[PDB]
């Protein structure tokens, strides 16, 4: 019964209870040390979570391991942890309560690993390799970090000329970068706060890089007022 | 929208930037935006969205955000809205989203948070009252640890409920069999018990045992303390 109570505590962001109830559960059902690690991560306790994670070796454990390492800025270890997964040197997580299983990581969701790998390479001083992970990630699925970094580098992969409001956001961005289209700016101006906050923000940045400081400040000023806390 | 499944997936991966972005595209499901913003550590931003709402779930996250920002009077006010029943039922939403919502029948959580807020806010006695009322419904960590600390845990005349029993007993008996019993579960439940033990010992002036207990946990679980 401790499981349902732990889930309920997570849902209420009552993490101390979840950590305590998790601690009680370690003996009975060891197939749950992952859960302890997660709740500890959620509570901002990365060094403690790592202690439990070292005792494990699954895709989910190595993933949270990388997250904890990243919080601690140990990028080399963060990277090593992720590669274990992508290189397929981890075991399948245990069959567990269904409510717990949902919190687990599927090795088929490689967008998330390549994305994190992109961030790590970048933060670690390997920008070009990072871009390569962002590219490989974006190839499977839209995620925020690969998209924003690829747009920033103008290195987003395009067809010869797949769907979604976000994929349209990317299309517009690629186009605006090379065209500075005012119709595009006006289109996204109406959605601030919202998707427009990102588009106009990126617009302002492009303008600066082009020396057009006037439009650059206009764009920034807009977001600063309609969404001051975004920036 | 297919955007839902993707947001859940991003939360599960702790890729919150993506979830915030995808949430921004989706903008009533404004609760979801508030949550993901809360998870990403962005309380002031989450409040902006939360002000636009009035449900049990919204007022709850409102209180959490306020508590992070140490605005205890507002945190308290937000919670009371729920307990006083001045909020609407959350919208019927995608099932994956519904799960992240707060049920007004889970009052242990509200009274517990209320206990923390009264305490942090300088009203210890009232806080104890919320802890007591919370503990009456269900074991939660903060009411239990504060009630044990104050020796104000309610007694008559689960493994966790056994932990509480042992703690009540050890407080008045200093039972060495109890200490030895929980000494084997460090790290674990023992870390709490022995840590509480060490505290009781100090309050009794028995500094020798107090340090023994603390030292134990410092070594078998240095990062607990
Ligand atoms: Cl969660």
A68 to A43, A47, A51, A55: CA distances (angstroms): 12, 7, 11, 15
Rounded to whole angstroms, how far apart are CA atoms B83 and B94?
26
Rounded to whole angstroms, how far apart are CA atoms B11 and B149?
36
| Tokens describing residue A135 | 């590219």
Rounded to whole angstroms, how far apart are CA atoms A157 and A160?
10
Rounded to whole angstroms, how far apart are CA atoms B106 and B76?
17
Method: X-ray
- Intra-chain end-to-end CA distance of chain A, in Å: 44
Give the one of B14, B25, B99 whose C-beta lies nearest to A67's C-beta.
B14
User: Nearest-CA distance from A20 to chain B in Å?
Assistant: 7
Rounded to whole angstroms, how far apart are CA atoms A181 and B136?
63
A146: nearest Cα among A107, A108, A112: A112
Phi, psi values for residue B155, rounded to 5°: -115, 155
| Tokens describing residue B86 | 């001045």
Half-sphere exposure (Cβ direction) of A15: Cα atoms closer than 13 Å: 14
Sorted by sequence, the CB contacts under 8 Å of residue A167 that are 6+ apart come out as A142
Q: Which residue has the tokens 């559960």?
A: A25
Partner-chain contact B140 A17, CB within 8 Å: yes
A103: nearest Cα among A113, A94, A91, A90: A94
Domains present along chain B, CATH in parentheses:
1-225 (1.25.40.10)
Sorted by sequence, the CB contacts under 8 Å of residue B9 that are 6+ apart come out as A109
Rounded to whole angstroms, how far apart are CA atoms A101 and A203?
41
| Tokens describing residue B43 | 């309380």
Sorted by sequence, the CB contacts under 8 Å of residue B132 that are 6+ apart come out as B143, B147, B152, B154
| Tokens describing residue B184 | 């084997």
Which DSSP string corresponds to A100-133? Answer: HHTTSPPTT-HHHHHHHHHHHHHHTT-HHHHHHH
| Tokens describing residue A188 | 């996204």
- Intra-chain end-to-end CA distance of chain B, in Å: 46
| Tokens describing residue A74 | 């140990």
| Tokens describing residue B6 | 């993707």
Report yes or no: A42 and A15 within 8 Å, Cβ to Cβ.
yes
Rounded to whole angstroms, how far apart are CA atoms A185 and A203?
8
Q: Tell how far the Cα of A10 is from the centroid of ligand 1, in angstroms.
A: 6
| Tokens describing residue A23 | 């601690």
CA dihedral B41, B22, B97, B133 (to 10 degrees): 10
3-class secondary structure for B157-188?
CCHHHHHHHHHHHHHHHCCHHHHHHHHCCCCC
Partner-chain contact A14 B163, CB within 8 Å: no
Longest dimension (CA), chain B: 63
**φ/ψ bin of A88: left (φ > 0), alpha (ψ from -120 to 50), beta (otherwise):** left
Quick count: other Cβ atoms within 10 Å of Cβ B183?
16
3-class secondary structure for chain A?
CHHHHHHHHHHCCCHHHHHHHHHHHHHHCCCCHHHHHHHHHHCCCHHHHHHHHHCCCEHHHHHHHHHHHHHCCCHHHHHHHHHHHHCCCCECCCCCCHHHHCCCCCCCCHHHHHHHHHHHHHHCCCHHHHHHHHHHHHCCCCCHHHHHHHHHCCCCCCCCCCCCHHHHHHHHHHHHHHHCCHHHHHHHHCCCCCHHHHHHHHHHHHHHHCCCHHHHHHHHHHHHHHCCCCC
Residue from A7, A144, A188 to probe the interface with B (highest B Cβ count within 10 Å): A144
Rounded to whole angstroms, how far apart are CA atoms B62 and B86?
14
To which H or E segment does residue A84 belong?
helix A75-86
Rounded to whole angstroms, how far apart are CA atoms B170 and A38?
32
Q: Tell how far the Cα of B12 is from the centroid of ligand 1, in angstroms.
A: 7
Partner-chain contact B163 A24, CB within 8 Å: yes
- Would you say the C-alpha torsion A139, A140, A142, A147 has a positive or negative sign? negative
């Amino acid at each position: 019964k401790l499981i349902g109570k732990i889930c309920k505590s997570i849902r209420y962001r009552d993490y101390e209870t979840a950590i305590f109830l998790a601690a009680c559960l370690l003996p009975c059902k060891p197939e749950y040390r992952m859960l302890m690690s997660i709740v500890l991560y959620l509570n901002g306790e990365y060094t403690r979570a790592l202690f439990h994670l070292h005792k494990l070796n699954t895709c989910t454990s190595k993933y949270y391991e990388s997250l904890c390492y990243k919080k601690k800025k140990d990028y080399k270890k963060a990277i090593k942890s992720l590669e274990s997964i992508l290189e397929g040197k981890v075991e399948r997580d245990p069959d567990v309560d269904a409510r717990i299983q949902e919190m687990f990581v599927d090795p088929g969701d490689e967008e998330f690993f390549e994305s994190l790998l992109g961030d790590l390479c970048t933060l670690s001083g390997y920008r070009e390799e990072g871009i390569g992970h962002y590219v490989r990630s974006f190839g499977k699925s839209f995620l925020f970090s690969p998209v924003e970094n690829l747009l920033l580098e103008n290195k987003v992969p395009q067809k010869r000329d797949r769907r979604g409001i976000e994929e349209e956001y990317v299309s517009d961005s690629i186009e605006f970068h090379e065209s500075l289209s005012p119709s595009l700016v006006k289109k996204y101006m109406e959605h601030v706060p919202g998707i427009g906050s990102y588009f106009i923000s990126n617009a302002a940045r492009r303008y600066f890089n082009l020396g057009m400081n006037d439009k650059s400040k206009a764009c920034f000023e807009l977001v600063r007022r309609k969404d001051p806390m975004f920036l």
